[PDB]
Design a protein around this ligand. Structure first.
Ligand SMILES: O=C(NO)c1c(F)c(F)c(F)c(F)c1F
Ligand SMILES: [K+]
Ligand SMILES: [K+]
Ligand SMILES: [Zn+2]
Length: 354
């Protein structure tokens, strides 16, 4: 009954050389790691080493063109880096960015391999840059390669092609890249909760709405839970898990669970505007542990209040370690009930548990 942890200080080297106060800070990962030490959680975990993803691994989800362009940034000069970053939606690049994105992915591959071989029951990956906005052919929203998507395909590559992987994306933003990568796939169930605001919230696309249920063989295997007009918090997230995430997940019966665990829905986040508490994230983690015989990998995505993300992700690791859930502190915001009912109607054709 062992929990893996991967963290490598080298991933701090990715930085914004024009705006050193950009919220996707190097110290996002060192702060989370530190909170694990001062809570004495780190000594309770088995440390899993980081490694570089290979280019062949990147090709599991990304085009050769995209891989070559990001790879080339390693040797670019500052003006050329600024030029190239400005060509994407919300990207900054330094000479170390490519290596850091490689390490983030390879860290998650090693963790998934530890889980699937039974060396650990579950694991946490304290990694940056994030992944879930990255598409097959382009970088986006602070993400270069789609770490969680790659890990799902890597896992299938060391087990069997049709291994059922559930990705739960509780980052406050829609994982546009993850949805698109698996949109026609019934082996990877993608469930995202996200602030939507009728398309006004980043990444600013109606792809995130509840009626995008998947395509082709994938119809039913893409579940968008979009929030509108409300400062959502633990009550809304508990209700979404009770009515939607957990029944669908149980029916799908995943063999591996990946959490795209952004902590920007947290109370205090400067961007998310939501109020999920650390005990909220602990309860969400604890519920997912009832799936896949406990085979859960928690992957850091976004989250920009250094205190909030450090407390929030430490509480997730505490639940993976088997600690009992802390106690939560209200009626759902009326628009949250609407959102949940919209998803319920959109997916009950495909999931009899709804
Ligand atoms: O955290 C994010 N995504 O997970 C994120 C964000 F919070 C922003 F404010 C952005 F402008 C952006 F491009 C992003 F990708
Ligand atoms: K999300
Ligand atoms: K899918
Ligand atoms: Zn986010």
């Amino acid at each position: 009954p062992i929990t893996g942890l991967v963290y490598d200080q080298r991933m701090m080297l990715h930085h914004n050389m024009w705006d050193s106060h950009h919220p996707e800070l190097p110290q996002r990962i060192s702060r989370i790691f530190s909170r694990h030490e001062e809570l004495r959680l780190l000594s309770r975990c088995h440390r899993i080493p980081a490694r570089l993803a290979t280019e062949e691994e990147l090709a599991l989800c990304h085009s050769s063109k995209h891989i070559s362009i990001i790879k080339s940034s390693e040797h670019m000069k500052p003006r050329d880096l600024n030029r190239l970053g400005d060509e994407y939606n919300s990207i900054f690049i330094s000479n170390e960015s490519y290596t850091c994105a490689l390490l983030a992915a390879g860290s998650c591959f090693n963790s998934a391999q530890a889980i699937l071989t039974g060396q650990v029951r579950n694991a946490v990956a304290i990694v940056r840059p994030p992944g879930h906005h990255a598409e097959k052919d382009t970088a986006c929203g602070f993400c270069f390669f789609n770490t969680a998507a790659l890990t799902a395909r890597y896992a299938q590559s060391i087990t069997r092609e049709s291994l059922r992987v559930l990705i739960v994306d509780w980052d406050v933003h829609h994982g546009n890249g993850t949805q698109h990568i698996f949109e026609e796939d019934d082996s990877v169930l993608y469930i995202s909760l996200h602030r939507y605001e009728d398309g006004a919230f980043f990444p600013n696309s109606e792809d995130a709405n509840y009626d995008k249920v998947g395509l082709g063989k994938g119809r039913g295997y893409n579940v968008n839970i979009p929030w509108n007009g409300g400062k959502m918090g633990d009550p809304e997230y508990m209700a979404a898990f009770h009515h939607l995430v957990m029944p669908i997940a149980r029916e799908f019966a995943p063999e591996l669970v990946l959490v795209s665990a952004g902590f920007d829905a947290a109370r205090g986040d400067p961007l998310g505007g939501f109020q999920v508490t650390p005990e909220g994230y602990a309860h969400l983690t604890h519920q997912l542990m009832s799936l896949a015989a406990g085979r859960v990998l928690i992957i850091l995505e976004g989250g920009y209040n250094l205190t909030s993300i450090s407390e929030s992700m430490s509480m997730c690791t505490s639940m993976l370690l088997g600690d009992s859930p802390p106690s939560l502190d209200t009626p759902l915001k009326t628009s949250a009930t609407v959102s949940i009912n919209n998803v319920l109607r959109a997916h009950a054709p495909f999931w009899s548990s709804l």
